[PDB]
Structure 1
Amino acid sequence: ANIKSQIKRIRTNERRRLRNQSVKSSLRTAIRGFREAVDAGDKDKASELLHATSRKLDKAASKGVIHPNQAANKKSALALALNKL
């Protein structure tokens, strides 16, 4: 509030947060759909949406929004429960 760089930085981080909230919400939609697919047993749709969610996680980590270790644990859970169903 008292440093002008901090003011600029405020509005900047507001923009950034907005962007990243939207990113995470989208990813969360993707995984919720995948879990519902697995849970009703559309194995076809399971893979047909897994491909989407997997590319989505990869390019999420690529933007530095989240770490590749996190993205890997996510994809691992997806892949494993798809293997089990």
Structure 2
Amino acid sequence: ANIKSQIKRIRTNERRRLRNQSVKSSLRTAIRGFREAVDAGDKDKASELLHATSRKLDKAASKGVIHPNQAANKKSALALALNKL
């Protein structure tokens, strides 16, 4: 670039990108684990992973990686999948 503030914001934005990347990846990993537990058919394991994943989604929404509405939609989908299981 050619401005100091942007030159710094490059570094900052990369930092925040790495953070949000790690967080979202952990979330998608939790969700794939949950969905594996469900499509396999386990129930109590699925409920435990659901609590953990909902916790992590609330956490990411509080950090700002995602929106609370997005977290809500994700965990609602998880809960309804578990219920209909």
Q: What is the TM-score with the length of structure 2 in the denominator?
A: 0.97
Structure 2: any 5+ residue segments left out of the alignment?
A: none
2:15 and 2:68 map into 1 onto residues whose CA distance is 23
Structure 1: any 5+ residue segments left out of the alignment?
A: none
Q: Deviations over 1:17-63 (max 9, x none)?
A: 01111110000000000000000011010011111001000111011
2:67 and 2:29 map into 1 onto residues whose CA distance is 19
Over the aligned positions, Cα root-mean-square deviation in angstroms equals 0.6
Residue 65 of structure 1 deviates from its aligned partner by 1.1
Q: Deviations over 1:54-80 (max 9, x none)?
A: 100011101111111111110110000
Aligned residues: 85
2:60 and 2:9 map into 1 onto residues whose CA distance is 23
Q: What is the TM-score with the length of structure 1 in the denominator?
A: 0.97
List structure 1 runs of 4+ shifted beyond 2 angstroms: none
SS at match of 1:74: helix
SS at match of 2:2: coil
